[PDB]
Write a protein that binds this DNA or RNA. Structure first.
Lengths: 116, 53, 109
RNA sequence: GUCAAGUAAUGAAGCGCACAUGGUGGAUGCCUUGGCAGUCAGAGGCGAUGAAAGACGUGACAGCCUGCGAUAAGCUUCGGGGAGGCGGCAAUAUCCUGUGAUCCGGAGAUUUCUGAAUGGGGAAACCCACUUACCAUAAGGUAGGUAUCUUG
RNA sequence: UGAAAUAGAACCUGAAACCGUGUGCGUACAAGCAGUAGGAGCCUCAAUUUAUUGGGGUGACUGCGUACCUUUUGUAUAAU
RNA sequence: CCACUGUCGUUGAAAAGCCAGGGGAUGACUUGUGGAUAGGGGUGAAAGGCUAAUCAAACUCGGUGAUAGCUGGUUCUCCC
RNA sequence: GGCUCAAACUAGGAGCCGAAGCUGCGGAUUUGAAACUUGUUUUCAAGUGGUAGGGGAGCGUUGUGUAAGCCUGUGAAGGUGUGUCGUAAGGCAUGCUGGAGGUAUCACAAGAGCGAAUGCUGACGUGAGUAACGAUAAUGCGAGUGAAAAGCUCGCACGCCGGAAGAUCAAGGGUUCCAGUCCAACGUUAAUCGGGGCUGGGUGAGUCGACCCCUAAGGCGAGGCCGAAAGGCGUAGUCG
């Protein structure tokens, strides 16, 4: 009962070469290089799934700092004033408001400054 | 003496980019009205209205 | 509309014939024939020969006016390689690739 | 419209990724004329009446393979069979065939040379012989015999 | 002619490496395992009462990021 | 016939050569043909030299899939 | 980078940033505890980094039964894309190519899964259109032929060997010898040319050599001697 590996090997290798589409050079053409690039790509995706939350929190904090300083206050005091006012708005929503609605963020800064 | 890592196809093509075929200039003799290379006599042998043979 | 001539099996490397092909690609048949007949490369005889075959095809089998024809597209492909042995010093042998090429020319308005 | 400042877009000698369409190459799938391991039976030898293995020839047709052996893809005889056939690459031509061909089975005849080779020798397919009988008259042909050992 | 001729004799199918041609986007002030997480622009299909979404192609710019195996106390290792 | 020096060559024209020089060149000389010595054996004006580009024990086949506490490799997935 | 009543140091105070830690939301899973109770359902508690290694649960491929079944020229296998499903191996469907086979479900057996072993076979890359085209004795021109002439034929001129690079043999090879015809492969380039392909022809002996007669070295060798067998030696003789 002999088994030939041709068909299964072909399909196994096509899966990897399909996941390796768009890569440079040997990485998208030959299996020995493509398979490493796909595994390394998965590793990068796994790590950046952690890192993306930090990056976006970073961006929200930067935008909130910019808005607070336009309204006459720093980020470390504006967040403290939020926490003393018992305002639960997250940094994502705060950055959205700062970026797309200046007057509402001004009102928020007024509440924070009244609480400070 | 030898490569440490095989040259890529793009790198190989970049060297080839400069190589180009030469295209000869073309003029027509008034007397015979035939295509011929610039400053070179015609197939028939009529050059600047003169008989070589 | 595209009339084709094929010159499978030229005794010359495709890499050499491609330099000739690049200069006649897209030109009118008159200019291409002039370039090929005043070219100093061996690939030029094969390319002119295939272009003439294509022009004859377009004029005889399809009744086209060769005055308005053009080299619509041309490319050279690698043919079958003849494998030969080259003796070297100290009793060592090397393989020799005597490469061939296939020339495809399509002419049309 | 001029000047000054600032700031876009556009480039492709070549290259990259994707797709479309090709060349090369011969994987894969399917297939087999070929192998492998066994069961149940048969048989277990061939050769001086020249073996096994060969060399050279043999056809209408040049080569190889197959068969054959100067009677040379063959001959005679005895059975089967009834319409095609002169083996294959591989066809062509001349032809054969119901007066039974081709083909199959049994028997017989022919069976060059080397090879145990056995008349002597030898670098296998070669050289040289002796002798009996007959034929020929010329410088030969036909049919035989001529190794060694053992036992009588 | 053949059902079929990219079944045309190197002839069933015809993968990959490798090498061409064509179309779309990017690329000549910018430094490194070449990806990944974002992301403008552009091109292309579909909708949608009409530049707004969905699918696909490319990827300006920003962050992070020194291959695989083996053997080792320990490898991007300039150890195999 | 030999091979003392140097350059070149060293993926060579050549798996030991070419060029310029060099030694013997009537002798313990050189060479043609045939034969004899066979592996723990041969031959050796002796270098462990030569014995078919292989010699501190030739080559071929067999024991044989020698043995290797050594090196290398050891192929699909998920859960504890 | 830059910083001097600091962006340094000392002693305090308040904010904020800051990890895959904790919390929030959704999902999977191991064990254990409760009950419709072999996943039949819902919950709760503690867990779920991992090399060597141990334990558990499966995927796919070849073949056998299921199967004289089912699918299949209204298109099997294979190849190439897309969509979709599962924690994964992977499954399903379908466009194109393909042209004759495949196999559901459950069991059963393995030549059952490759990226590495300076692994084996074949094909194809980089170096790269780079080195090199094999004695530096040498070629120039005019005609001929031809698709094409630096190389072929003829002609003129030039150069090299000439104790050979001339001629006759032995050994070895075996048709390479001559003529016609051809340029796909071979000739390190072109080729009309060739020791290349194809088709024909050519080798004439009493005196040349071989065979033949004779023998050297060395073999073999009725009888004979020796030796577990195989065989070794050796006389007459016979070859050489």
């Amino acid at each position: 009962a002999r088994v030939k590996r041709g068909v299964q090997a072909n399909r196994r290798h096509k899966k990897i070469l399909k996941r390796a589409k768009g890569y440079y050079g040997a990485r998208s053409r030959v299996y020995r290089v493509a398979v490493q690039a796909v595994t390394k790509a998965g590793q990068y995706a796994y790590r950046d799934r952690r890192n993306k939350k930090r990056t976006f929190r970073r961006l929200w904090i930067a935008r909130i700092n910019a808005g607070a300083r336009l309204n006459g206050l720093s980020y470390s005091r504006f967040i403290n004033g939020m926490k003393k006012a018992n305002i639960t708005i997250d940094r994502r929503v705060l950055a959205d408001i700062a970026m797309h609605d200046a007057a509402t963020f001004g009102a928020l800064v007024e509440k924070a400054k009244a609480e400070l | 003496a030898v490569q440490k890592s095989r040259k890529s196809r793009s790198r190989r093509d970049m060297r080839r980019s400069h190589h180009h075929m030469t295209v000869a200039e073309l003029s027509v003799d008034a007397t015979t009205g035939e295509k011929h290379r610039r400053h070179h006599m015609t197939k028939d042998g009529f050059y600047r209205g003169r008989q070589l043979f | 509309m595209e009339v084709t001539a094929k010159l499978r099996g030229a005794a010359i490397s495709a890499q050499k014939v491609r330099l000739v092909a690049d200069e006649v690609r897209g030109k009118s048949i008159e200019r291409a024939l002039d370039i090929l007949t005043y070219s100093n490369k061996k690939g030029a005889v094969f390319v002119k020969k295939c272009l003439n075959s294509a022009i004859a095809n377009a004029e005889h089998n399809h009744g086209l006016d060769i005055d308005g024809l053009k080299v619509a597209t041309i490319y050279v492909d690698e043919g079958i390689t003849l494998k030969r042995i080259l003796p070297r010093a100290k009793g060592r042998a090397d393989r020799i690739s005597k490469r061939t090429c296939h020339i495809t020319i399509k002419v049309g308005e």
